[PDB]
Amino acid sequence: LTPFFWLFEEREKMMEFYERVSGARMHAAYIRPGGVSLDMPLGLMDDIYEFASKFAERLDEVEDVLTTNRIWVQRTEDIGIVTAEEALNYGFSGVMLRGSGIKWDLRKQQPYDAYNLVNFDVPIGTKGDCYDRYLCRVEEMRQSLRIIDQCLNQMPAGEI
Amino acid sequence: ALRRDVSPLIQRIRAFLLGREHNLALRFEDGLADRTQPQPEIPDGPSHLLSANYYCQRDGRREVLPPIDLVEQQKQLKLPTPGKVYAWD
Amino acid sequence: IKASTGLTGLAVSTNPHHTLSALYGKILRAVSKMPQDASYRKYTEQLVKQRADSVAQHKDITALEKAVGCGQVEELIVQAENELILARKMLGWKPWEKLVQAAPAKQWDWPPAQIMEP
Amino acid sequence: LGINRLTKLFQMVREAGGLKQAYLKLYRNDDLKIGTLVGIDKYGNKYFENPYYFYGRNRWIEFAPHVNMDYDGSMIPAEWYGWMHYKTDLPPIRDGCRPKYKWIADHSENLSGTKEAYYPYSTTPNKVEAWEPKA
Amino acid sequence: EPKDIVEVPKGYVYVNNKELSMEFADITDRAASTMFFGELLRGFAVTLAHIFKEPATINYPFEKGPLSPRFRGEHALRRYPSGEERCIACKLCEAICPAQAITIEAEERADGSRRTTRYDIDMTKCIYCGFCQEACPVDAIVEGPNFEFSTETHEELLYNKEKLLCNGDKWESEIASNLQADHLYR
Amino acid sequence: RGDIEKVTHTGQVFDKEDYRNARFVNAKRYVNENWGIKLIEEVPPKECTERVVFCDGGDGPLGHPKVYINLDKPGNHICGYCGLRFVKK
Amino acid sequence: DKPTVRQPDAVARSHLSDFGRYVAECLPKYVQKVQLTAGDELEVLIAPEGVVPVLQFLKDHHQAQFTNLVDIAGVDVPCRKNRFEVVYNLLSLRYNSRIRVKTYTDELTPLDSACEVHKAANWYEREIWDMYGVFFANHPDLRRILTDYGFEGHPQRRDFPLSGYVELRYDDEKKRVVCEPLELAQEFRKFDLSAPWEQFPNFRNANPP
Amino acid sequence: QQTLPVAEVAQNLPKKGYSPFGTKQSSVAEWSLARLDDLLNWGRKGSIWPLTFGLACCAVEMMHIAAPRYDMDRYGVVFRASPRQADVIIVAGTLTNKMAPALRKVYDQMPEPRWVISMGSCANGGGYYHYSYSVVRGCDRIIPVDIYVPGCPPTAEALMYGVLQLQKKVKRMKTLQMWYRK
Amino acid sequence: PPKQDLPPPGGYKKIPFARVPPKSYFTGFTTIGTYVVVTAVGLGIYYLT
Numbered sequence A: 001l002t003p004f005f006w007l008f009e010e011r012e013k014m015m016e017f018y019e020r021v022s023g024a025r026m027h028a029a030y031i032r033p034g035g036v037s038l039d040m041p042l043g044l045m046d047d048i049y050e051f052a053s054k055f056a057e058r059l060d061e062v063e064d065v066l067t068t069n070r071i072w073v074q075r076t077e078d079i080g081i082v083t084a085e086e087a088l089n090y091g092f093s094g095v096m097l098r099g100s101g102i103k104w105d106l107r108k109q110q111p112y113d114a115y116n117l118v119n120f121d122v123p124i125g126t127k128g129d130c131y132d133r134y135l136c137r138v139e140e141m142r143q144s145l146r147i148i149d150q151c152l153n154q155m156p157a158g159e160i
Numbered sequence B: 001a002l003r004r005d006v007s008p009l010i011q012r013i014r015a016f017l018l019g020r021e022h023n024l025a026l027r028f029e030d031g032l033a034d035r036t037q038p039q040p041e042i043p044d045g046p047s048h049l050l051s052a053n054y055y056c057q058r059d060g061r062r063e064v065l066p067p068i069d070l071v072e073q074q075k076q077l078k079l080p081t082p083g084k085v086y087a088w089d
Numbered sequence C: 001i002k003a004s005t006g007l008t009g010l011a012v013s014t015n016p017h018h019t020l021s022a023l024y025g026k027i028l029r030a031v032s033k034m035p036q037d038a039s040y041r042k043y044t045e046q047l048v049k050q051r052a053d054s055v056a057q058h059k060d061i062t063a064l065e066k067a068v069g070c071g072q073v074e075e076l077i078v079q080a081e082n083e084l085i086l087a088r089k090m091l092g093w094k095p096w097e098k099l100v101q102a103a104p105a106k107q108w109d110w111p112p113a114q115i116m117e118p
Numbered sequence D: 001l002g003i004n005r006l007t008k009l010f011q012m013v014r015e016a017g018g019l020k021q022a023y024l025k026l027y028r029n030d031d032l033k034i035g036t037l038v039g040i041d042k043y044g045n046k047y048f049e050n051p052y053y054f055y056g057r058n059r060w061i062e063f064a065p066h067v068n069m070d071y072d073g074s075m076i077p078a079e080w081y082g083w084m085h086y087k088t089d090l091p092p093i094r095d096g097c098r099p100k101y102k103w104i105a106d107h108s109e110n111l112s113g114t115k116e117a118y119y120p121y122s123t124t125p126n127k128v129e130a131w132e133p134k135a
Numbered sequence E: 001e002p003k004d005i006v007e008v009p010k011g012y013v014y015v016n017n018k019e020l021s022m023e024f025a026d027i028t029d030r031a032a033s034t035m036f037f038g039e040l041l042r043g044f045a046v047t048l049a050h051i052f053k054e055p056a057t058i059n060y061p062f063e064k065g066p067l068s069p070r071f072r073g074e075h076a077l078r079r080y081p082s083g084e085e086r087c088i089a090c091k092l093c094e095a096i097c098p099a100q101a102i103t104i105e106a107e108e109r110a111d112g113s114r115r116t117t118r119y120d121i122d123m124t125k126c127i128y129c130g131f132c133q134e135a136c137p138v139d140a141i142v143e144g145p146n147f148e149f150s151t152e153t154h155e156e157l158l159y160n161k162e163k164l165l166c167n168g169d170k171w172e173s174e175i176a177s178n179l180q181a182d183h184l185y186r
Numbered sequence F: 001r002g003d004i005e006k007v008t009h010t011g012q013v014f015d016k017e018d019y020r021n022a023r024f025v026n027a028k029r030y031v032n033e034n035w036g037i038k039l040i041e042e043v044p045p046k047e048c049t050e051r052v053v054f055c056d057g058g059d060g061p062l063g064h065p066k067v068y069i070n071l072d073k074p075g076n077h078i079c080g081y082c083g084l085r086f087v088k089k
Numbered sequence G: 001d002k003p004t005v006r007q008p009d010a011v012a013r014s015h016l017s018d019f020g021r022y023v024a025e026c027l028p029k030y031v032q033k034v035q036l037t038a039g040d041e042l043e044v045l046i047a048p049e050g051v052v053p054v055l056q057f058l059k060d061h062h063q064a065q066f067t068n069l070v071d072i073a074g075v076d077v078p079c080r081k082n083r084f085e086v087v088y089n090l091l092s093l094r095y096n097s098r099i100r101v102k103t104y105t106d107e108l109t110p111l112d113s114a115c116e117v118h119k120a121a122n123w124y125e126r127e128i129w130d131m132y133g134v135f136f137a138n139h140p141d142l143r144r145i146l147t148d149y150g151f152e153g154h155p156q157r158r159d160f161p162l163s164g165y166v167e168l169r170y171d172d173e174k175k176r177v178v179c180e181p182l183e184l185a186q187e188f189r190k191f192d193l194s195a196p197w198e199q200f201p202n203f204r205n206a207n208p209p
Numbered sequence H: 001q002q003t004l005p006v007a008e009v010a011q012n013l014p015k016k017g018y019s020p021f022g023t024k025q026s027s028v029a030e031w032s033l034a035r036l037d038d039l040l041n042w043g044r045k046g047s048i049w050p051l052t053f054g055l056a057c058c059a060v061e062m063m064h065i066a067a068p069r070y071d072m073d074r075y076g077v078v079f080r081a082s083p084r085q086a087d088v089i090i091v092a093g094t095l096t097n098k099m100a101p102a103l104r105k106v107y108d109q110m111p112e113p114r115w116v117i118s119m120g121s122c123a124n125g126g127g128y129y130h131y132s133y134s135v136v137r138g139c140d141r142i143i144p145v146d147i148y149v150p151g152c153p154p155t156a157e158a159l160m161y162g163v164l165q166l167q168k169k170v171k172r173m174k175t176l177q178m179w180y181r182k
Numbered sequence I: 001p002p003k004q005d006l007p008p009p010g011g012y013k014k015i016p017f018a019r020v021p022p023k024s025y026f027t028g029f030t031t032i033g034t035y036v037v038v039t040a041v042g043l044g045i046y047y048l049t
């Protein structure tokens, strides 16, 4: 229980940010064909900065608690091995695929948004377990964080 | 005198127990932005340029074509590969 | 020797040259049975022979990997095996022949449901 | 132990009005805190802010006393609603730039499950007229 | 650090290439960890510690919030500074309403003005998307900030124009504040 | 009760023998107390000099779209949107 | 000098274009047409019989190596004698490119199954079978997926009312939920959003018979 | 429509009492039965146990309420998984035809006094999918709804406000006091 | 002053995205040896008890 609750504390901060821009907790309509529906309120940049500032602490607290824990490790590790070939022929993708070993990802290969202007590395596993898949998700959180660093630092002015 | 914190003793033990130097998580008015802000002006766009700005010579929806038939394209006129080989390995 | 293939299930395979050579031989014969005027044939020989000619010059497996590109040997053998099945099925399919069916008029026309001038 | 914390308890407990006036406040609000009278509501409510706490606790309300324990979420009036949500940083006492029109009603609770409840009804006078035999 | 097990190029990070050493100090470390549950002790002390962080529960309904000026909640039909109804029955709000939760019937009031007779919203079909207010050309209808509008009976949710006007009257001050905040920005 | 007697400005009262009255035996029939027709009537008709005036009703982008109203006719001229009234004389 | 208008990847258009001709001249009996949609994707229009051969050809041959089968998208178009159209949108990790295969069929004739080619498709065929009624031959188990049990008709067809024919409630006489003929509190109000003025000349006479 | 009293009116008025019944009871039996109802309602009001049905999209808010920002066990609310031990059911998300018999079955397997909160528009009136061939238009057509929490989804504050409103309904329920008349 | 959301002067300090373990108080040798020492003293005290 404790991991879920500690993280759902921080989920509240992020939803508040969605609320700040769009006006809805979830289910914004903020992204629209001609770009985003609306501009951003001033200062939301800074609040994002402190939130990102603290998120490393929060994520590490749960990470140190739960990644190494024997019960969790044995409870997930070597569960449902997903071999590489079997993964492809079944039409997988995402961190599942990326965990099984395939070095594929849509951001790096078929970039669609400003990801051209951000440098970062995806995580990859080599065991195809639920555990190393879980690790891949955890490292993805960390890597996304630096992506916010790049973008939020370089944000240009202009129309929206 | 700035943020409601547990008394200094419990703070020190708390830092000890965690094993990392602790930084506060609750959000205070001081910590977060000036919560009432001046009115923003959104800078005018580049197509709002006032002249030489014809829609006909910058529009996309009227620019797209129907799909072309490649065989018939040739009839009008290095083993080929869909794209740069990726070492998905 | 490389410790791991980096992928689950895909194990490190020794004698890759022997396996690759053997696979290339069989597929070449498999296309041999094909008719001489089949585009599938025309290209498979040149592609496979290019591969099966690159197989030799680079005794080092890593050197061969760079020379052939297209991925690592462990997957590469699987690519070859796939094509073996393709040729056996291809011979059984006779796809070099001409059109089985002509699409009905207005089949592949978009947008639909619009009157026309005769 | 009591590192200038029992002192703070003495402030809130004593100046509340004694054992009775600390317990009833605690008994009703399930917590006792210290702030400053931001502004007295038109309807007996009293608003308190203190930057010592954080955003959840920054601002709070002591509902009107005559509401014994029937406090409700809707008791906040319109002019104070925005401040209470950290939606406007301008206390209504301070910004007189908001409209002061006449037709504005006075506040009301979620009048539901009671004879005062709203209930919908058609807002179009009938469509087709029936022929009248007398005329 | 132990060496890797698969050599990695850039643009990637393998999260398991690190080797589990067989050095005696390394095995005895792991053995001692299992024999005395050091890792559990680390996690155990964490939760003890994290008692000593102050909980972040808002004492609702006394303490409450925060929201933002754009919050989409109770609907309201505003009135001009004179008190006249802003809505002119242009019917765009209905035409855009994704849920088709809006029904409108308009005629001429005796003065000859274009105004609604029936104006209905079903907040059991509305999605509080705000497309209606983004479309209305005179800011007639707005997603007022109230969100505690909870009813014991389903019928009580189908608002008609009388209910909507009442909310506008009730909430006019706050709605005025938000629009002054966002009109030039929206 | 008066609640189920009042005439909605739209002009509806349930007939005295109409079963749809029943729905209010236990709930109020909300009827608004401000009738736009009366209010705009009270507002006096503004007057100007120029043949053609302009109204936005409200203010800036907080009102209705800017509209130009000619006043050469003898009578009043009602703003289409806001119902404001103009008279040149 | 038109920042609003995007500029596709031209070199990608080059490769897909030449490769598309490769496919056409390698599978003459099946490939009916190969076109390059302006969105840079590549479409391969085949006759119903060659479904598996095309897919098997693609997933296997070196130059294709299109392993992943993203989905089986079903399209319905009355006024086409055999209307129900199918789309097999594939990916190729080796070359980092996407391809689309398309075929047609009526509401009666069956259709080849991709279960034997890509294990990924198994559920999709079940989905189209439920949603349109396009039978699939050799499919292992053609059980319905989405619609509830004992559901009659396949709703995604365009000759099927939006709200369906029946709707459920609960009975006290029978302590059970019963399906009843439709009855709507407010009939779904369409809006007739038809353009009177042709906003697109380029597609007017192009693609004529 | 009514409105709150003004400052001076509040000054005249006394305490609003605690038991919503009041303290005007005539005889010993009346006064005694008033207290026992108050105790019963107090028990059923303070401790209420949702079932966590939570089909969809709305469910995320149904979890955020459990989250530590608007703490709900603070009020005495706990998520018992087993419907035999759950006292309240927060139906949240859409009710498709496949689900309709399931919801019915879960509802009546729960023992009473059972109260249902219809959270979200999808449950209230079918929400955004109202004209769909597969959705139960509302959940009023399967079960007796008690409290409606409008929203899509309702902000967590709105949800637990409704919970308090259910507590008020649980507070004013008259069972012993009015059995005496029965 | 600002008219639109932009980063402040000097940009922003890099966000930390690096794992960091805590103090590693003991090692296999230290832990076990200390355990046996405690047990040995415990045996003696029980003897005297």
Ligand code: SF4
Pocket: E086, E087, E088, E089, E090, E091, E092, E093, E094, E104, E135, E136, E137, E138, E139, E140, E141
């Ligand atoms: S969009 Fe505004 S003015 Fe037009 S009908 Fe709707 S509420 Fe009235």
Ligand code: SF4
Pocket: E093, E096, E097, E098, E099, E100, E101, E102, E121, E125, E126, E127, E128, E129, E130, E131, E132, E133
């Ligand atoms: S918020 Fe969206 S769904 Fe609700 S009435 Fe407005 S337009 Fe319709």
Ligand code: SF4
Pocket: H056, H057, H058, H092, H093, H094, H119, H120, H121, H122, H123, H127, H128, H151, H152, H153, H154
């Ligand atoms: S009512 Fe809104 S939040 Fe709830 S399930 Fe439906 S769409 Fe999602």
Ligand SMILES: [Zn+2]
Pocket: F055, F056, F057, F058, F064, F079, F080, F081, F082, F083, F084
């Ligand atoms: Zn006007």
